Amino acid sequence: LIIAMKHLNDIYEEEPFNFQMVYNEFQKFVQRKAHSVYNFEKPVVMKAFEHLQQLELIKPMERTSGNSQREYQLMKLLLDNTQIMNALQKYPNCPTDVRQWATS
Amino acid sequence: FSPRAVYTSGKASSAAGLTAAVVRDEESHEFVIEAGALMLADNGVCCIDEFDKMDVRDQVAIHEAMEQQTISITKAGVKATLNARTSILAAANPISGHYDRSKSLKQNINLSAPIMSRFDLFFILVDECNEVTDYAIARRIVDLHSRIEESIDRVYSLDDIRRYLLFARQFKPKISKESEDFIVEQYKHLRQRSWRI
């Protein structure tokens, strides 16, 4: 999810985003690959996004509730590309596919 | 390599020059047909460079020869049909010369839907900055520039390839039942998923 977020920040220079775009491009990544074992449904990815927001790596803009759901909410990342690269280098068991997707 | 190959540029070619033209003969005082590139490339291969720059008025003329393999002329009291048994190899670049990832794939190609449909193989090339690829490309180019002949290792001679291709083209293989049902199931899976199939 973080790599997808970085790709979104690179393609759209300094603009917010929501859950749907991240989900769509994660689906694109898992569909381009032939048969990789990443068949996950919407609720589990939603829970993972909620956990990421809970750890306060992502912060909302102009906070409001009720009018806007958790979906369709403008999120931003609080990390730098070099930090992500350095952290990913020290990841214990990073698979090859996700590493190459991050490089791409 | 292929002696039966014809080359042409995109914009410099007109509609008449591609398929055929109707011209009045000076001595006979009548109308005859002057051949175009496509009918000269019969049973060969025709290569088009910068296919994007061609006007739609030219590609619509190409349309018939693309699929029906023949060209029909019904102009100025001249009625005829001609064989256009050719294989077309087209080269082009995306819109504005760069593949913009901020836009959709469909928005990156300015080609009509039937033209997109009528190509069997459609390859799209994207350039990326990788150090190993850069090193390989640079060493290959410099080796070719410095060592012109000793840097070429060909497994088979070009004339040998030509003779083998000539010998092979006359065979007409039959389709097996196993190949038949394998093709059926493969097409099932493929079609169950812009460039519509």
CSV table of C-alpha atoms in Angstrom, one decimal:
chain,number,residue,atom,x,y,z
A,1,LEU,CA,0.0,0.0,0.0
A,2,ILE,CA,2.8,2.4,0.8
A,3,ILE,CA,4.5,1.7,-2.5
A,4,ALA,CA,1.3,2.4,-4.3
A,5,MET,CA,1.0,5.6,-2.3
A,6,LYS,CA,4.5,6.7,-3.4
A,7,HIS,CA,3.7,6.0,-7.0
A,8,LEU,CA,0.5,8.1,-6.7
A,9,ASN,CA,2.6,11.0,-5.1
A,10,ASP,CA,5.1,10.7,-8.0
A,11,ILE,CA,2.6,10.7,-10.8
A,12,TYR,CA,0.4,13.4,-9.3
A,13,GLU,CA,2.8,15.9,-7.9
A,14,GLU,CA,1.8,17.0,-4.4
A,15,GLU,CA,-1.9,16.2,-4.5
A,16,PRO,CA,-4.1,14.4,-2.1
A,17,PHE,CA,-5.8,11.0,-2.7
A,18,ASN,CA,-8.4,8.6,-1.4
A,19,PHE,CA,-8.9,4.9,-0.8
A,20,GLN,CA,-10.4,4.1,-4.2
A,21,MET,CA,-7.5,5.2,-6.4
A,22,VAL,CA,-5.0,3.2,-4.2
A,23,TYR,CA,-7.3,0.1,-4.4
A,24,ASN,CA,-7.7,0.5,-8.2
A,25,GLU,CA,-3.9,0.7,-8.8
A,26,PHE,CA,-3.2,-2.2,-6.4
A,27,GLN,CA,-5.7,-4.2,-8.4
A,28,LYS,CA,-3.9,-3.2,-11.5
A,29,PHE,CA,-0.6,-4.4,-10.1
A,30,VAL,CA,-2.0,-7.7,-9.0
A,31,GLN,CA,-3.8,-8.2,-12.3
A,32,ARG,CA,-0.8,-7.5,-14.5
A,33,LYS,CA,1.1,-10.3,-12.8
A,34,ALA,CA,-0.2,-13.7,-14.0
A,35,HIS,CA,-1.2,-15.7,-10.9
A,36,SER,CA,0.5,-14.2,-7.9
A,37,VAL,CA,-0.9,-15.0,-4.5
A,38,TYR,CA,-2.5,-11.7,-3.5
A,39,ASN,CA,-6.2,-12.4,-4.0
A,40,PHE,CA,-7.6,-10.2,-1.3
A,41,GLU,CA,-11.1,-8.6,-1.1
A,42,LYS,CA,-12.1,-5.0,-0.2
A,43,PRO,CA,-12.7,-5.3,3.5
A,44,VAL,CA,-9.2,-6.6,4.5
A,45,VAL,CA,-7.5,-3.8,2.5
A,46,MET,CA,-9.9,-1.3,4.1
A,47,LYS,CA,-8.9,-2.6,7.5
A,48,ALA,CA,-5.2,-2.3,6.6
A,49,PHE,CA,-5.8,1.3,5.5
A,50,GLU,CA,-7.5,2.0,8.8
A,51,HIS,CA,-4.5,0.6,10.7
A,52,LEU,CA,-2.1,2.7,8.6
A,53,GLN,CA,-4.2,5.8,9.4
A,54,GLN,CA,-4.2,4.7,13.1
A,55,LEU,CA,-0.4,4.6,13.2
A,56,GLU,CA,-0.5,8.3,12.1
A,57,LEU,CA,1.6,7.9,8.9
A,58,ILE,CA,-1.3,9.5,7.0
A,59,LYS,CA,-3.3,12.5,8.1
A,60,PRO,CA,-6.6,13.9,6.9
A,61,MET,CA,-7.1,17.4,5.4
A,62,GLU,CA,-9.8,19.7,6.7
A,63,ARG,CA,-11.2,17.1,9.1
A,64,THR,CA,-14.9,16.3,8.9
A,65,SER,CA,-17.1,13.2,9.6
A,66,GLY,CA,-20.6,12.1,8.5
A,67,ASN,CA,-20.6,14.3,5.4
A,68,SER,CA,-17.6,12.3,4.0
A,69,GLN,CA,-17.0,8.6,4.7
A,70,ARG,CA,-13.6,7.1,5.3
A,71,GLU,CA,-13.7,6.4,1.6
A,72,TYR,CA,-13.5,9.4,-0.7
A,73,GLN,CA,-11.4,11.3,1.9
A,74,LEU,CA,-8.4,13.4,1.0
A,75,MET,CA,-5.3,11.7,2.5
A,76,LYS,CA,-1.7,12.7,2.4
A,77,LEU,CA,1.6,10.8,3.1
A,78,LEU,CA,4.0,11.9,5.8
A,79,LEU,CA,7.2,10.1,4.4
A,80,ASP,CA,10.0,10.8,2.0
A,81,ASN,CA,11.1,8.6,-0.9
A,82,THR,CA,14.6,8.1,0.4
A,83,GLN,CA,13.2,7.0,3.7
A,84,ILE,CA,11.0,4.4,2.0
A,85,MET,CA,13.9,3.1,0.0
A,86,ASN,CA,16.2,2.9,3.0
A,87,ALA,CA,13.6,1.1,5.1
A,88,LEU,CA,12.8,-1.3,2.2
A,89,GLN,CA,16.5,-2.2,1.9
A,90,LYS,CA,16.5,-3.4,5.5
A,91,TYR,CA,13.2,-5.3,5.2
A,92,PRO,CA,13.9,-8.9,6.3
A,93,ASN,CA,11.9,-11.0,3.7
A,94,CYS,CA,10.8,-8.5,1.0
A,95,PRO,CA,9.6,-10.5,-2.0
A,96,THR,CA,11.2,-9.9,-5.4
A,97,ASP,CA,8.0,-8.8,-7.1
A,98,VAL,CA,7.2,-6.0,-4.7
A,99,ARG,CA,10.8,-4.8,-4.7
A,100,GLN,CA,10.8,-4.6,-8.5
A,101,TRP,CA,7.4,-2.9,-8.5
A,102,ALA,CA,8.8,-0.3,-6.0
A,103,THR,CA,11.8,0.3,-8.3
A,104,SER,CA,9.6,0.7,-11.4
B,1,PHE,CA,17.0,-8.8,-46.1
B,2,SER,CA,13.8,-9.5,-48.0
B,3,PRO,CA,14.1,-8.7,-51.7
B,4,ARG,CA,10.3,-8.3,-51.9
B,5,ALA,CA,10.2,-5.4,-49.4
B,6,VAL,CA,9.0,-1.9,-50.0
B,7,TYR,CA,9.7,1.1,-47.8
B,8,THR,CA,7.8,4.4,-47.5
B,9,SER,CA,7.4,7.5,-45.3
B,10,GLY,CA,4.1,8.6,-43.8
B,11,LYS,CA,3.3,12.2,-44.8
B,12,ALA,CA,5.0,12.2,-48.2
B,13,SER,CA,2.7,9.5,-49.4
B,14,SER,CA,-0.7,10.4,-50.9
B,15,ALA,CA,-3.9,8.4,-51.2
B,16,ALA,CA,-3.3,7.8,-54.9
B,17,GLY,CA,0.4,6.8,-54.4
B,18,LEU,CA,-0.5,4.1,-51.9
B,19,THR,CA,-3.1,2.0,-53.6
B,20,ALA,CA,-3.3,3.3,-57.2
B,21,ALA,CA,-4.2,6.4,-59.3
B,22,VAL,CA,-6.3,7.1,-62.4
B,23,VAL,CA,-4.3,9.1,-65.0
B,24,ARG,CA,-5.2,10.0,-68.6
B,25,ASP,CA,-2.8,8.5,-71.2
B,26,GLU,CA,-1.3,11.1,-73.5
B,27,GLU,CA,-1.3,9.1,-76.7
B,28,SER,CA,-4.5,7.0,-76.3
B,29,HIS,CA,-6.7,9.9,-75.0
B,30,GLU,CA,-8.3,7.6,-72.4
B,31,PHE,CA,-7.9,6.8,-68.7
B,32,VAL,CA,-5.6,4.2,-67.3
B,33,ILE,CA,-4.4,3.1,-63.9
B,34,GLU,CA,-1.0,3.9,-62.5
B,35,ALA,CA,0.1,1.4,-59.8
B,36,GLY,CA,0.6,2.3,-56.2
B,37,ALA,CA,3.0,1.1,-53.6
B,38,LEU,CA,0.6,-1.5,-52.1
B,39,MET,CA,0.0,-3.3,-55.4
B,40,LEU,CA,3.7,-3.2,-56.2
B,41,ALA,CA,4.4,-4.9,-52.8
B,42,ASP,CA,2.2,-7.8,-53.8
B,43,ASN,CA,3.1,-11.1,-51.9
B,44,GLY,CA,5.8,-9.0,-50.1
B,45,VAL,CA,6.0,-6.7,-47.1
B,46,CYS,CA,5.3,-3.0,-47.0
B,47,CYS,CA,6.9,-0.8,-44.3
B,48,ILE,CA,5.4,2.6,-43.3
B,49,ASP,CA,7.4,5.0,-41.2
B,50,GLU,CA,5.7,7.7,-39.1
B,51,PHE,CA,2.3,6.3,-39.5
B,52,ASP,CA,0.8,8.8,-37.1
B,53,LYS,CA,1.6,11.8,-39.4
B,54,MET,CA,-0.6,10.3,-42.2
B,55,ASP,CA,-3.9,12.0,-42.7
B,56,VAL,CA,-7.2,10.1,-42.0
B,57,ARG,CA,-8.0,10.5,-45.6
B,58,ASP,CA,-5.1,8.2,-46.4
B,59,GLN,CA,-5.7,5.6,-43.7
B,60,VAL,CA,-9.3,5.2,-44.8
B,61,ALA,CA,-8.0,4.4,-48.3
B,62,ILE,CA,-5.6,1.8,-46.6
B,63,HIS,CA,-8.6,0.3,-44.8
B,64,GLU,CA,-9.7,-1.9,-47.7
B,65,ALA,CA,-6.3,-3.3,-48.5
B,66,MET,CA,-5.8,-3.9,-44.7
B,67,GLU,CA,-8.6,-6.5,-44.4
B,68,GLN,CA,-10.2,-7.5,-47.7
B,69,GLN,CA,-6.7,-7.8,-49.2
B,70,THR,CA,-7.9,-6.1,-52.4
B,71,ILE,CA,-8.4,-2.6,-53.7
B,72,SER,CA,-11.4,-1.4,-55.7
B,73,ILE,CA,-11.5,1.7,-58.0
B,74,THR,CA,-14.7,3.2,-59.3
B,75,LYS,CA,-13.4,6.5,-60.5
B,76,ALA,CA,-14.2,8.6,-63.7
B,77,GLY,CA,-15.7,5.8,-65.7
B,78,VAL,CA,-12.9,3.3,-64.6
B,79,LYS,CA,-14.1,0.2,-62.7
B,80,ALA,CA,-11.6,-2.3,-61.5
B,81,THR,CA,-10.5,-4.6,-58.6
B,82,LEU,CA,-6.8,-5.4,-57.9
B,83,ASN,CA,-5.1,-7.8,-55.6
B,84,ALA,CA,-3.2,-6.3,-52.6
B,85,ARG,CA,-1.8,-9.4,-50.9
B,86,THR,CA,0.6,-7.5,-48.6
B,87,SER,CA,1.9,-7.6,-45.1
B,88,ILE,CA,2.0,-4.2,-43.4
B,89,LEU,CA,4.6,-3.2,-40.9
B,90,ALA,CA,3.8,0.2,-39.4
B,91,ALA,CA,6.0,2.4,-37.1
B,92,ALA,CA,4.7,5.2,-34.9
B,93,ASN,CA,5.1,7.2,-31.7
B,94,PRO,CA,2.5,8.1,-29.1
B,95,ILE,CA,0.9,11.5,-28.8
B,96,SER,CA,3.3,14.4,-28.2
B,97,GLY,CA,6.2,11.9,-28.6
B,98,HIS,CA,6.2,10.9,-24.9
B,99,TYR,CA,4.1,8.3,-23.1
B,100,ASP,CA,2.4,10.4,-20.4
B,101,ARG,CA,1.6,8.1,-17.5
B,102,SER,CA,-0.7,10.7,-16.0
B,103,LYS,CA,-3.2,9.9,-18.8
B,104,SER,CA,-5.0,6.7,-19.7
B,105,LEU,CA,-3.6,4.2,-22.2
B,106,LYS,CA,-6.4,4.9,-24.7
B,107,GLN,CA,-5.7,8.7,-24.5
B,108,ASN,CA,-2.0,8.0,-25.4
B,109,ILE,CA,-2.7,6.6,-28.9
B,110,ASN,CA,-4.4,8.8,-31.5
B,111,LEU,CA,-5.6,6.0,-33.8
B,112,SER,CA,-9.1,5.0,-35.0
B,113,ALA,CA,-10.7,1.9,-33.5
B,114,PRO,CA,-10.8,-0.3,-36.7
B,115,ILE,CA,-7.2,0.5,-37.4
B,116,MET,CA,-6.3,-0.6,-33.9
B,117,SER,CA,-8.4,-3.7,-34.4
B,118,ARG,CA,-6.8,-4.8,-37.7
B,119,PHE,CA,-3.2,-5.2,-36.5
B,120,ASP,CA,-2.5,-8.8,-35.4
B,121,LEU,CA,0.5,-7.7,-33.2
B,122,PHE,CA,0.6,-4.3,-31.5
B,123,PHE,CA,3.7,-3.6,-29.5
B,124,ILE,CA,4.2,-0.5,-27.3
B,125,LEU,CA,7.8,0.4,-26.2
B,126,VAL,CA,8.5,2.4,-23.1
B,127,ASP,CA,11.9,3.8,-22.3
B,128,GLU,CA,13.3,3.7,-18.7
B,129,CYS,CA,16.5,4.8,-17.0
B,130,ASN,CA,18.3,1.7,-15.8
B,131,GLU,CA,22.1,1.7,-15.2
B,132,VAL,CA,22.6,-1.9,-16.5
B,133,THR,CA,20.6,-1.3,-19.6
B,134,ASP,CA,22.5,2.0,-20.2
B,135,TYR,CA,25.8,0.1,-19.8
B,136,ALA,CA,24.8,-2.6,-22.2
B,137,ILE,CA,23.5,-0.2,-24.8
B,138,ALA,CA,26.6,2.0,-24.6
B,139,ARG,CA,29.0,-0.9,-24.9
B,140,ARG,CA,27.1,-2.4,-27.8
B,141,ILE,CA,27.1,0.9,-29.7
B,142,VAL,CA,30.8,1.7,-29.1
B,143,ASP,CA,31.8,-1.9,-30.0
B,144,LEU,CA,29.9,-1.6,-33.2
B,145,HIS,CA,31.5,1.8,-33.9
B,146,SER,CA,35.0,0.5,-33.2
B,147,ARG,CA,34.9,-3.2,-34.2
B,148,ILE,CA,32.7,-3.2,-37.2
B,149,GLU,CA,33.1,-6.8,-38.5
B,150,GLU,CA,34.8,-8.8,-35.7
B,151,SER,CA,31.9,-7.9,-33.3
B,152,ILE,CA,29.4,-9.9,-35.4
B,153,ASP,CA,28.6,-13.6,-34.7
B,154,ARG,CA,25.9,-15.0,-36.9
B,155,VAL,CA,24.7,-18.5,-36.3
B,156,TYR,CA,23.5,-18.9,-39.9
B,157,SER,CA,24.2,-17.1,-43.1
B,158,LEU,CA,21.6,-14.6,-44.4
B,159,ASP,CA,21.5,-16.5,-47.7
B,160,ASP,CA,20.9,-19.7,-45.8
B,161,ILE,CA,18.0,-18.1,-43.9
B,162,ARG,CA,16.6,-16.9,-47.2
B,163,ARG,CA,16.8,-20.4,-48.7
B,164,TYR,CA,15.3,-22.0,-45.6
B,165,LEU,CA,12.4,-19.5,-45.6
B,166,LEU,CA,11.7,-20.1,-49.3
B,167,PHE,CA,11.7,-23.9,-48.7
B,168,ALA,CA,9.4,-23.6,-45.7
B,169,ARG,CA,6.8,-21.2,-47.1
B,170,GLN,CA,5.4,-23.8,-49.5
B,171,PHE,CA,4.2,-26.2,-46.7
B,172,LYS,CA,0.6,-26.0,-45.5
B,173,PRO,CA,0.2,-27.5,-42.1
B,174,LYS,CA,-3.0,-29.1,-40.8
B,175,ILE,CA,-4.6,-28.2,-37.5
B,176,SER,CA,-5.0,-31.1,-35.1
B,177,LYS,CA,-8.0,-31.7,-32.8
B,178,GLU,CA,-5.9,-31.3,-29.7
B,179,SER,CA,-4.7,-27.9,-31.1
B,180,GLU,CA,-8.4,-27.2,-31.9
B,181,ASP,CA,-9.8,-27.6,-28.4
B,182,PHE,CA,-6.7,-26.0,-26.9
B,183,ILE,CA,-7.3,-22.9,-29.1
B,184,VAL,CA,-11.0,-22.9,-28.1
B,185,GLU,CA,-10.3,-22.9,-24.4
B,186,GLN,CA,-7.4,-20.4,-24.7
B,187,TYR,CA,-9.6,-18.0,-26.6
B,188,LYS,CA,-12.4,-18.6,-24.1
B,189,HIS,CA,-10.0,-17.5,-21.3
B,190,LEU,CA,-8.5,-14.6,-23.2
B,191,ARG,CA,-11.8,-13.1,-24.4
B,192,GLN,CA,-13.5,-13.5,-21.0
B,193,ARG,CA,-11.2,-10.7,-19.8
B,194,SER,CA,-9.4,-0.2,-25.7
B,195,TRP,CA,-7.9,-2.8,-28.0
B,196,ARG,CA,-10.9,-5.1,-27.9
B,197,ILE,CA,-10.5,-8.8,-28.7
